[PDB]
Amino acid sequence: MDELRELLKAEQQAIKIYKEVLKKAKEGDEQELARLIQEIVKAEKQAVKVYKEAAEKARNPEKRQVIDKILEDEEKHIEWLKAASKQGNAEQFASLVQQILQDEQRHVEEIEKKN
Q: Which of residues 11-50 bind Zn ion (CB under 5 A)?
A: 44
Q: Rounded CA gap, 107 and 104, in Å?
A: 5
- CB 8, min distance to Zn ion, A: 10
Binding residues for Zn ion, rule CB under 5 A, total: 5
* 57 DSSP 8-state letter: S
- Considering the rule CB under 5 A, would residue 74 count as an interface residue with Zn ion? yes
- Considering the rule CB under 5 A, would residue 107 count as an interface residue with Zn ion? yes
Across 51-61, b (16+ Cβ under 10 Å) vs e yields beebeeebeee
- Considering the rule CB under 5 A, would residue 104 count as an interface residue with Zn ion? yes
State the residues that interact with Zn ion by CB under 5 A.
Answer: 44, 74, 77, 104, 107
